[PDB]
Amino acid sequence: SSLPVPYKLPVSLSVGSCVIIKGTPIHSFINDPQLQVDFYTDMDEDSDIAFHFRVRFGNHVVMNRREFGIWMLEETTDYVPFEDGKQFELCIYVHYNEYEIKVNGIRIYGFVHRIPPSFVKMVQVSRDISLTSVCVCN
Amino acid sequence: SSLPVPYKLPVSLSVGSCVIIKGTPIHSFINDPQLQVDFYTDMDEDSDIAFHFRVRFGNHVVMNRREFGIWMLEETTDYVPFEDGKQFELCIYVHYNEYEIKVNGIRIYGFVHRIPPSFVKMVQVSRDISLTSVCVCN
Ligand SMILES: OC[C@H]1O[C@@H](O[C@H]2[C@H](O)[C@@H](O)[C@H](O)O[C@@H]2CO)[C@H](O)[C@@H](O)[C@H]1O
Ligand SMILES: OC[C@H]1O[C@@H](O[C@H]2[C@H](O)[C@@H](O)[C@H](O)O[C@@H]2CO)[C@H](O)[C@@H](O)[C@H]1O
């Protein structure tokens, strides 16, 4: 891996920001690797989470938020167009009302803001992946 | 311009970070547009500056830092391979001992750290340019 995992990046996000994550799962899909991205409101991992994104490769994605320390209503999609064994590109674009999530150029979901994205102070990338790069663009 | 100018981006920099700035001068070179990039230690524009980079297009570049409110010893280079009227790409890569500055893929200078780059909390891009994008990569 080019970066440590878990990778905790301090960030300032605004509408128009794009978080681009490139990496590779460290297990084949029959071994169910996971990839997790958390948009944290502080560096402390017990802080609230504006957007939690957990992929079970070859299976499904779960999304949620954590508010006042409580996990809210979970959202899910079965569209996870990752390829077994290959590097992926995960783009999270901050729109005015939602995070748009793209996997290898394919829009899979729009997760609507329940707190403003400017409250996000740290992005954590975790679980069963090797990381090539993380970019934050405006 | 795609972004406001002056553009003040809150950042966290570490060794291995790369700041990529894409834009276009808003005047032809015979009218001496300038481009300025400041690595500020706070959002306040009177805070100390770890790395100040001021291009006079078609002429020369000045670099400096501001410590305890005082401008230090100015450094300069005449290598400024920007093209009149065209979009440029300005990359500032954070090495362990210096900032490496590349203009349109060409390394022009290495500005050595006098305070650690982790002290940089805001990057300001200013003066006579239109901005296409600013990315911070690790
Ligand atoms: O919702 C994200 C959140 O889910 C937790 O796991 C859920 C699980 O997805 C669900 O199937 C089960 O019924 O309840 C669990 C508790 O909410 C995870 O523990 C948590 O880390 C998040 O991933
Ligand atoms: O060194 C960067 C700093 O320079 C100031 O201008 C200098 C100028 O470059 C020099 O030729 C003259 O002799 O002294 C001036 C004052 O230091 C700028 O005013 C400042 O904004 C920075 O660009």
Residue numbers in the entry:
A (entry chain A), B (entry chain A): 2 to 139
Question: Can you list sentences taken from the study reporting this PDB entry?
Answer:
Galectin (Gal) is a lectin that binds to β-galactosides.
All three other variants (R53HH57R, R53HR55NH57R, and R53HR55NR57RD33G) co-crystallized with lactose, but not Tris, even when the crystallization conditions contained 100 mM Tris. This indicates that these three variants prefer to binding lactose. Without this residue, Gal-13 cannot bind lactose. Arg57 in one conformation could indirectly stabilize the pyran ring of galactose through a water molecule (W). In the crystal of wild-type Gal-13, Asp33 from one monomer occupies a large part of the ligand binding site of another. However, in the R53HH57R variant, lactose repealed the side chain of Asp33, making Asp33 adopt an awkward conformation.
